Write a sequence for this structure.
């Protein structure tokens, strides 16, 4: 099930959802939360939706009339004429799935640094390398990622670190050692708390 | 037990020569005037006061209050038979249903064959071509009943109750006669509705589609059909 993206909504409207069908090898490509980009064909699928006014029947074109005691009336007459409602709904039959805004230009089962590095083009990874060797990258990322927020340099640094996160570990006995930084921003009204959250979310 | 041809003559006689001095003391035929008004389609409802009937036939009022649905039908029959002889001009066809009635009447005249006896089903249902509706006003000699005490012993009887209205539905169209057309013949098919539900017809029964032994599937339509303003209320004991 997908739904229309929030940049596409008309005024006053709830997002439209449609169910798309993936087949043989595209089958497991789209996961929940992904902004994906389906190419395929819009199709009708017979539906079960009635108790409305009857409409759009299909019956045989053979001119046929039941005899006394077998009159073409009621349930028997509808079964004999072979009448059935024509109810359809729109479904998308997708032959291919891809992200709308891809992260890399090189490829898209598991994730290791070398797998990521191969997944990207030579230009993209030379950029990645040259910022990895960049001194002052801490401040560079803080400024590049909250460009409109003045002050609050500590909050910028903390949020950036939370974005990178630590190393999750499991003890021998079984307890998991958390590796995710959680950050809370407490402050007076109109101090850009909601703005920090919006920056990260976008 | 009783003969309804004689009862129809009785109610015709009542409708034609009952008079009252209601019009400022002037003696008017109370129901003949209304027969005029609803023969020219200037009135729909005829409220037959049963106090008026009781002035000269209390046995009739007893019969009415004891069956009350046979007699509503009888009164509608009698007024429908009296209307042609009270019509003093030609109706202006204020309505769309009137056009259907006029076309059906004109076609029936056109293919009349007056001496030929047509099938009982080869006719217009009475309810399809009335345009008026007849109601009783209970005799005042009937004391009003209490909603609790209107029970199975008064099924079919005319009763009067009073209470608070608690709930009224919206006015919506109730099918009275469902009209169908066929895809082969050109005849109309009528299905008077008495039950709260009905199964729409499938095959047409007209003479031509029986002679031809053709398919003759028929199509339910609102345009020729008869609806009535319908409304359901709940009324409550005082
Ligand atoms: N230090 C700051 N630098 C830039 N803009 C700020 C700053 N503090 C507040 N604002 C502005 O105030 C507006 C309201 O901030 P908001 O994120 O709603 O604050 P909060 O939700 O914390 O009350 C924001 O649009 C933001 O642009
Ligand atoms: Mg806020
Ligand atoms: Zn026909």
């Amino acid at each position: 099930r997908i739904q229309e993206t929030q940049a596409e909504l008309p005024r006053g409207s709830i997002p439209r959802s449609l169910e798309v069908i993936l087949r043989a090898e595209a089958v497991e490509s789209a996961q929940a939360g992904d902004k994906c980009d389906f190419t395929g064909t819009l199709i009708v699928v017979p539906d079960v939706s009635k108790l409305s006014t009857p409409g759009a029947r299909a019956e045989t074109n053979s001119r046929v009339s039941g005899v006394d005691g077998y009159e073409t009336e009621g349930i028997r007459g509808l079964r004999a004429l072979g009448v059935r409602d024509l109810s359809y709904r729109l479904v998308f039959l997708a032959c291919c799935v891809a992200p709308t805004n891809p992260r890399f230009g090189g490829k898209e089962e598991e994730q290791t640094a070398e797998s990521i590095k191969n997944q990207m083009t030579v230009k993209e990874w030379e950029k990645v390398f040259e910022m990895s060797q960049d001194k002052n990258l801490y401040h560079n990322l803080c400024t590049s990622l909250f460009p409109t927020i003045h002050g609050n340099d500590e909050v910028k640094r903390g949020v950036l670190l939370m974005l990178f996160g630590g190393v999750p570990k499991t003890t021998g006995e079984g307890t998991s050692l958390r590796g995710d930084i959680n950050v809370c921003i407490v402050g007076d009204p109109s101090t850009a708390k909601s703005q920090f959250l919006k920056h990260v979310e976008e | 037990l009783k003969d309804y041809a004689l009862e129809k003559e009785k109610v015709k006689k009542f409708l034609q020569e009952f008079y009252q001095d209601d019009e400022l003391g002037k003696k008017q035929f109370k129901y003949g005037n209304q027969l005029v008004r609803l023969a020219h389609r200037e009135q729909v409802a005829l409220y037959v006061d049963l106090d008026d009937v009781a002035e000269d036939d209390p046995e009739l009022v007893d019969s009415i209050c004891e069956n009350a649905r046979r007699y509503a039908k009888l009164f509608a029959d009698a007024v429908q038979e009296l209307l042609p002889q009270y019509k003093e001009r030609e109706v202006v066809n204020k309505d769309v249903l009137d056009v259907y009635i006029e076309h059906r009447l004109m076609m029936e005249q056109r293919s009349r064959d007056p001496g030929m006896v047509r099938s009982p089903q080869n006719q217009y249902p009475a309810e399809l071509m009335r345009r008026f509706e007849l109601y009783f006003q209970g005799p005042s000699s009937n004391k009003p009943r209490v909603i609790r005490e209107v029970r199975a012993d008064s099924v079919g009887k005319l009763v009067t109750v009073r209470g608070i209205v608690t709930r009224v539905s919206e006015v919506k169209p109730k099918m009275v006669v469902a009209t169908y057309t066929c895809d082969q013949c050109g005849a109309e098919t009528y299905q008077p509705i008495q039950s709260p539900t009905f199964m729409p017809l499938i095959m047409c029964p007209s003479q031509e589609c029986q002679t031809n032994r053709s398919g003759g599937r028929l199509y339910l339509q609102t345009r020729g059909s008869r609806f009535i303003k319908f409304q359901e209320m709940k009324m409550q004991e005082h």
